[PDB]
Symmetry: D2
Subunit: 482 residues, 4 copies
């Protein structure tokens, strides 16, 4: 059983929902859904905590307490690994090396920035010759509403909660209904670490007519930060508009990888394998479109096919497992529906295209095969809409400007990876991709000080580094006439 | 007054009247852009990004922007006249605040465009060869600009200057009530050699007009707006499906606070200005005033005196201090607050009506500078934004009390504090829940500072680097070595 | 006994010298003086250490190790308190709440800054229209020679060593002969924490024709950072000139305090008492000149007399001890010589002027009385020369511009404290004072992110925050034509 | 015809010295050498101008006035060209497109940074719980002493004078005896722009026992910034040592170009031709050492020989002129003394090696030939000592780690140019070169915002961008207790 955490107490709710293990379809736990009344209690508790001990902590004391939260996750490391794996079916090795360490690192990085961050001093002259001073300060924005996704549950959850707390805000967070275990554990770490009641609040539930909608509509929040589907971003923006709430969105992507004729071909095959199928292609940053220079296109597709078919699709702790299932049955229905749509649009299915057959309990889970399509036009729905499964379409190109234009011809703009060994090409091309993040000869390498976010439908605002310290703060200007 | 689109001055199939509010006389007809014309503006701005404007170095861009500035300086007095006519502002203030600030907007952001740089982050990797992350600023794209009538050219250019400085193209809809200086600006840009499609001026209104069409148009990348909060919320919903970047500077109900240890004459002068400047039609004006009990009556009587000394009349009159409100429709809204004040229990210390001229001005849109006392913190006249030359004055006793009373608001743009005490100034300033605090002064602006509000008073910050960030895509480029 | 620490090993020397407890003149330990050959050994080992594991550490791992050093000092907190107190006589109170906590915070602040710090990206246009990028990086400068003072032994020692290590340098450091203990213990902490051999080297000795000089002359160093007497600063600057070594100097001052008529009078009396007599007036930052507006002058002098006479002078762990002895008998000779000079120049001795009579072992120590002078002119030697003991002279003033000129009419310019409750005056007056550091209504309040340094004879350069990160690094610009 | 400019007046002197045209050895003008007394008068007047209307300008007005200076140079553009060409023999085209535009840009860039630069606000907590603010401000350092070189007279002179004035200092500036004309014209432009008297002072003369040394010894300056030979940098550091004056040094170098096998070969030949022979190899950034991968070595050398022999050495207005003379006969004697040393050391002379025969007035000037050597060892003097003439030695190399070691095996480290088309190599190699400036696939591309300086004997400190705004300012911390 997974309880809510409100004003320093773990509390049940009236109704509950099932958390299902996508590996086998079995029940992991029951999760009490916070109702509107409990959400209001969380918000009000969070407002009030801003006037309690939390509000009086020095930036050094606040940061030391956040490092302690992080020590707590570390001390329960394997429990956190086990929770993420149960909920989502992610390979244990990924949970051990990507997800939980990044969740620890999020807290440490922003606790550090809390200590080092400063503001600005501007001098000016005036008519009377005595001058003025303008200095700025950072204050907590207020209560931050976090609605976070199921694909990187603890990582993306802490990505928001860490800078929010580092900036002195209080929090009411709603983790995905598909993945609530690690967040529920984080609350326990919060509690045991002595985080004052009301600072961090955890409400479980869904979106519409549930905890997520209640949060989004509550007038006592000062901001809503959200990662997830683009149409949901749009819904959230409409919902907080009457309140003119500060908003921060990381949304969909139809991300491209580009492979030039001078790429290290083996490294690019391996890189596109990772960018297409990591977390079974359920990363916002995954490459679902791939452009490859004509002269190496056949060799690239053949190489990637071989490598994709070597992927081990199986149990999270199975020997050399690469790929787990999708998050849920309902998500798999959506993915398989694009699988059929691609055949109908005229794709050649280079590999995959269906669901593997296990002849064991995994057949009741939510697996699909890693899939490569070829032969679709740039207009096809499967080349333009985010699928959020382990798939990519590969298309040839001849000319640099042509491929830049094809990558950019999109209502999204989150990320792009480019493969080339040429110094000029790397820099010339990357600056021309209309996205928030480019990688050259790698993918999803993250320095947490960098600005991160997207253009067009992929989001608005930036987080990371000082961008987060600014978003989760009131920036106030104080002008002294001397 | 014509629209300016893709390098050409063009008419529309419908015009509206621009009325001089000093005397009710028609100044000019203004062609209203239709949906088809707004689309034409946006499409041309989009195309302008791939033309000569797009290929200018940052140094040549800034030079051209400095040339726009020079262009305005060269026609300074036509600009003063245009702004006066539209709005009735004192000729002196147009001449030393409005027009100079608009020129400084262009110059400051041109200068920032040349000095701004971005970031390099080094990192280690597993294989031990490392990686580099660097950031770049790029044009965001087409900037939709919808701007207010109270400081027409100043607030128009406050947005347009950073948009252009960051290499964007612009589709700008100035207020229906003050379309003249913008139209001149378009002439300056045309004569200065700004490439076609880079700057586009479209005239009209909000709902079912140019403004609405702009905000609904999918070709823009951002919408920056200064105005009413409710209009802000409307825009946010309209751009939500395209998840457009937004920047809002919205209403306030701003307070001025006078502590017992203030320089009382300076404070009286200060609040006089903060209350009645531009006939109280700055979003930054003080419509609430808290004065320490020990000095409350002396402050009110002094403010009464100085307020009654203000000269209300012609923009060019000898010692004029105030002009009219922007329009009859706005005077109607303001006179309706004047009545609501009485009906709410207010003591009228001064004004509370219109003045009498017995000449054309009676056809104008004047109201008197007004002071109220005796209302409660929950009176509507003390909570809601009026945007006229009026303030209510209320006593206070304690520091924590007045802080709480200032912050007890759904708005939070600005606040002025009067005190001679060092500790008090810094202690109290930091606790006011607004974007902008002034101590011992008001509306003193350094264009590098973050400017914006909290709560209903806005979203985001503009000014200095905050503008340079808002009006650009920040992109991260990560090179594995 | 106290050894040098060279290339991973404690070692003795030919010569040794005594370390004397200034409370009672008794021997604490023998200290081995490093010779030229062993200084050469230290520099060469530091050079090679740059090419060993130390140099392969990530910024993250380097920072973690520097936090381990800080941990290792926290774990021996009281031993470090004991060692500082023994060498110098400072009250145990001050060692526990200022000295040792700073040494520790020095390492932690600079380790944090190493993790958060980044550099710059400048794009530019070029003729051919393809453009160029300039990006800068921070690299280790090389071997940093550190020569440090006895007045704040571990605090000022670590103030240099911490940023030097945080920036990836290696270090050869010479603590003061008068206070070698806390540094030798620090060497132990480094050894125990696994600091690779050669990264940190400790050499004992004196200046001329001893370790200090040898260090400054050695061609193998990249920089010389020094805190102390101005003339010594000049001497070091000449000695490194042939090698054009980077230099950073925090030198002396004759710091003033200004009390304006609208000051909080009791607060100003307390603050000037603290800025004149803290550490027995042996801080670079103490106020030896004081200017008080005429209207409150007599009342200020009377009040300070009373408070200075309530000061407890005695043992480091005595009840509410306020002052210990001076660092040494030799230093007391110099200070008393000044006490006589002040009388000779026609000063009224308001209080003090001598040494107290203990009638116990403290009579064998190096104590003097807190002293206050009036009636000297601005040109008197005792008003213009740094005495570095617990004394201040007080003079009246009438005008603001007048007292600004009087404070500024000095060949030094480290620090100044001003007392006033007036908003305008604090900002108007502070910006006109020709020094590196001004305090308003307080003194020696340190934020370790701020630039610290002086003007004129009081120094060269700035340290603290980014200024330390720039000083202890090569800043390199890399320009890529695209 | 060349007078000093002191406290607002052009004044002559007791002695005069001749300014000779290096194209033909003919007298251009006589220059009045400043004596110790005039040097004192210049400093004293600079100190007073700080207290005058100059000191009171807002930053906006001071910047407005620096732009006027720029405008005034621009209105007399061709006279500045004539003056530069006359003193130095520089090709008119280069004077007209590099030297004078850069001189004007220096002023515009720093006037602009004066208006945009701001400082820092640090908040901090305190024991009593009400906290404190620290903020910084930039103020004029004071009187800046400028001593500038003959190789880029107006460019390097204004590179120091622009930021000095932009930060509100006053200046006493001693231009090179070899090239005093353009600085004297600047003085006229200053006068005519209405720069208040004493703000800018021009003194002419030599170094030791002349205006150079006297400026350097005056206690009245706050800083001395100098570009030129390293030994003269050392001498300077010693002379201001008793003063602890701020110092900023851009000294010599023995800069390398490195060409890897994957370079665009024709681009690298053109690039090394420029880096070797521009301004007749009298730029401190010139490459006198070149390392070329053995596989392209013969082809590179053979290609560079051809391009070198296509260089037109002659008159500044000669139809296709590429190179003018060296700066003086005195300089030519040194360079020819190296051309012989090279032969005596065993060099093969690929081309040049002597002086060309014009059979006209040019034979009385100071020309040498563009020269290329091979065959020397890395320890040869001609490969290790700065010649400062139009020459380079070319050596082959095999390994990347090897060429990096050979490049870095130098007491200097000013700049390096690398040629490669490989992305990783470019970034991997550049960061390992121990210099202040690396160019990749170009040379002497300058963005004035970037830090500019050297390591080891090549310099001290950084200039450019905020590094200039920081060096030419007092940085002051003001700490307000609340
Ligand atoms: Na913010
Ligand atoms: Na942006
Ligand atoms: Na400085």
């Amino acid at each position: 059983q997974l309880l809510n955490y409100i004003d320093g107490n773990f509390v049940t709710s009236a109704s509950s929902f099932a958390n299902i293990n996508p590996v086998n379809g079995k029940l992991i736990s029951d999760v009490f859904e916070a109702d509107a009344k409990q959400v209001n209690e969380a918000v009000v508790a969070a407002q009030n905590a801003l006037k309690g001990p939390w509000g009086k902590l020095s930036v050094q004391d606040r940061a030391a307490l956040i490092h302690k939260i992080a020590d707590g996750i570390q001390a329960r490391f394997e429990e956190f690994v086990a929770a993420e794996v149960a909920d989502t079916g992610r390979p244990v090795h990924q949970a051990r090396t990507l997800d939980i360490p990044r969740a620890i690192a999020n807290f440490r990085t922003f606790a550090d920035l809390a200590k080092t961050s400063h503001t600005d001093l501007f001098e000016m002259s005036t008519s009377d010759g005595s001058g003025a001073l303008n200095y700025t300060v950072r204050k907590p924005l207020g209560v931050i509403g976090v609605i976070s996704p199921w694909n990187l549950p603890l990582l993306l959850f802490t990505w928001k909660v860490a800078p929010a707390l580092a900036c002195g805000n209080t929090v009411v967070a709603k983790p995905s209904e598909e993945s609530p275990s690690s967040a529920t554990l984080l609350a326990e770490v919060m509690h045991d670490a002595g985080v004052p009641p009301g600072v961090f609040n955890l409400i479980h539930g869904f979106g519409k007519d549930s905890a997520g909608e209640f949060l989004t509509q509550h007038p006592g929040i000062s901001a809503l930060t959200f990662t997830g589907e683009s149409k949901t971003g749009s819904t959230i923006m409409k919902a907080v508009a009457d309140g003119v709430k500060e908003v921060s969105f990381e949304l969909g992507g139809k991300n491209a990888a580009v492979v030039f004729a001078d790429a290290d071909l083996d490294a690019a095959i391996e890189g596109v394998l990772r960018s297409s199928f990591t977390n079974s292609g359920q990363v916002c940053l995954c490459s679902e479109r791939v452009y490859v220079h004509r002269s190496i296109f056949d060799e690239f597709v053949s190489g990637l096919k071989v490598e994709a078919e070597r992927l081990v699709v199986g149990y999270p702790d199975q020997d050399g497992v690469n790929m787990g299932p999708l998050i849920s049955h309902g998500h798999r229905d959506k993915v398989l529906s694009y699988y059929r749509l691609a055949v109908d649009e005229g794709a050649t299915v280079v590999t995959g295209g269906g669901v593997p057959k296990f002849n064991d309990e995994r057949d009741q889970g939510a697996y699909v095969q890693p899939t490569i399509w070829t032969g679709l036009s740039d207009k096809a729905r499967c080349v333009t809409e985010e699928i959020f499964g382990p798939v990519c379409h590969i298309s040839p190109f001849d000319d640099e400007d042509e491929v830049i234009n094809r990558v950019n011809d999109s209502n999204y703009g989150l990320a792009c990876a480019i493969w080339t060994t040429n110094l000029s090409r790397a820099h010339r091309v990357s600056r021309q991709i209309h996205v928030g993040l480019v990688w050259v000869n790698t993918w999803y390498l993250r320095d947490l000080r960098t600005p991160f976010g997207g253009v067009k439908l992929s989001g608005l605002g930036r987080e990371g580094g000082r961008f987060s310290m600014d978003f989760y703060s009131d920036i106030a200007n104080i002008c002294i006439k001397i």
